Amino acid sequence: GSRKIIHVDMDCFFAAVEMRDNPALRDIPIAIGGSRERRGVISTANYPARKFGVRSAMPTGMALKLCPHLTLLPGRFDAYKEASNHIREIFSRYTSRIEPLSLDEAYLDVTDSVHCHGSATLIAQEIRQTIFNELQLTASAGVAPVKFLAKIASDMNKPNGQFVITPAEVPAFLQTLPLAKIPGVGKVSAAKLEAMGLRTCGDVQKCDLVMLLKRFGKFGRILWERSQGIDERDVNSERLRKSVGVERTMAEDIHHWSECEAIIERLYPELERRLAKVKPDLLIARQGVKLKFDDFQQTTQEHVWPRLNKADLIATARKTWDERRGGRGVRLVGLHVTLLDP
DNA sequence: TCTAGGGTCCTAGGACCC
DNA sequence: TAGGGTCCTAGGACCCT
Ligand SMILES: [Mg+2]
Ligand SMILES: [Mg+2]
């Protein structure tokens, strides 16, 4: 009983939308990201910019040093949300078994699909073609028997391509697969694994589950499982958002409580507006604040609270400011709510 | 170069309950 | 009756763009 999992992933999503809506941007290096003066980072870049080394999460000052002609865009999030809604509606034409992971990607379980003669390869191709036909954006896709391999596979033939891993091909694929390619294995984990001589899934296959469990806890079981292609996580179409946050990094650090309070006055109506979209009565489980300091340590303090309330967020930020700032500049202020459970 | 803003999930100590 | 359970909370790795 092998499943058929597709992972669909839009190509250079934000930049692809901006190029479609303004073809003057198609052939020059562009990126969505905050300006160097706004102390921004790159959200994403198109391929002309990626050629210079520009990457997501790169500080904008670095991207502009690599690519002096980089054209920087602020982002049009309703445009991306509209594209997201459209591709999820296209997914629904093939299956209801859809787990979105972000605006531009989703897992599909097409095990029980009768479309395209049961071929997940052809379903993926048809989805990608339909997306191009109806949105004039391209997507890539990965097909595999489990989630994480499908998600890895969708990167292998990007842009505008796809890659299929059959069960017969899984062992050879895993043997030299870098651990850092597994979603959830990030820089810190890959470095700790590298330092004990573990770089690939083939390396972890030579390890004892008990050792990994002592050395990493539950993460060690996930590493053990993924390194032999085990991933029983079902595609789940019923996940719901659990939190809403609004935060801003200032162009210059602030050093005075008056400046912090003034920023919160701007953030609060935005938090209220976004909460009201999903919870019109503003009823919540917790609310709280975030400060990030000029040396990049960050603190959050949140608490049980029944309904979004500005004065309590200001009061809480004042306590955090007085108690934890230690004369440092503050580069970021944020507000936060935790939503009621169901 | 100088480090975003939207989030999910896991950990772990103490409070609290029995 | 010596420890078994379950929330509150802060922090941090990690994910997407
Ligand atoms: Mg993408
Ligand atoms: Mg994606």
> Which domains, ranges and CATH numbers included, belong to chain A?
1-21+75-175 (3.30.70.270), 22-74 (3.40.1170.60), 176-230 (1.10.150.20), 242-342 (3.30.1490.100)
Structure tokens at A250: 């200032």
Query: Of A309, A292, A301, A184, whose CA–CA distance to A248 is shortest?
Result: A292
A303 DSSP β-pair partners: A287
Closest protein CA to C1' of nucleotide B3, residue: A59
Distance of A252 CA from C4 C1′ (whole Å)? 52
Distance of A188 CA from C14 C1′ (whole Å)? 10
For residues A9 and A158, the answer to whether their CB atoms sit within 8 Å is yes
Distance of A184 CA from C13 C1′ (whole Å)? 8
- Please write down the long-range contacts of A268-274, taking CB distance under 8 Å and 24 or more positions apart: A268/A310, A268/A313, A268/A335, A270/A246, A271/A244, A271/A245, A271/A246, A271/A308, A271/A335, A271/A337, A272/A308, A274/A244, A274/A246
* Annotated binding-site residue? A234: no
Who's near A185: CB < 8 A, 6+ residues apart? A179, A193, A223
Per residue, the 3-state secondary structure of A166-214, as one string, reads: CHHHHHHHHHCCEHHHCCCCCHHHHHHHHHCCCCEHHHHHCCCHHHHHH
Chain B bases having any atom below 7 Å from a protein CB: 1-12
Question: Which residues of A does the annotation mark as catalytic?
Answer: 105
Structure tokens at A112: 């029980």
Instruction: Report how far Cα A204 is from the mean position of its chain's Cα atoms.
Output: 26
Instruction: Report how far Cα A331 is from the mean position of its chain's Cα atoms.
Output: 23
Please report the resolution in angstroms.
Answer: 1.7
Phi–psi pair at A335, nearest 5 degrees:
-115, 155
Nucleotide with C1' nearest the A183 CA: C15
Alpha helices in chain A (DSSP H): 13-21, 47-50, 60-66, 77-92, 120-135, 147-156, 170-175, 187-195, 201-205, 209-216, 218-226, 257-278, 310-324
CA atoms within 13 A on the CB side of A43: 19
How remote is the CA of residue A140 from the centroid of ligand 1, in Å?
A: 8
Ligand closest to the CA atom of residue A14: 1
How remote is the CA of residue A10 from the centroid of ligand 2, in Å?
A: 6
Q: What technique was this entry resolved by?
A: X-ray
Closest protein CA to C1' of nucleotide B6, residue: A245
Ligand closest to the CA atom of residue A151: 2
Look up residue A304 and give its amino acid: V
Beta-carbon neighbour count of residue A229 at 10 Å?
Answer: 20
* Annotated binding-site residue? A112: no
For residues A230 and A146, the answer to whether their CB atoms sit within 8 Å is yes
Structure tokens at A120: 């997940």
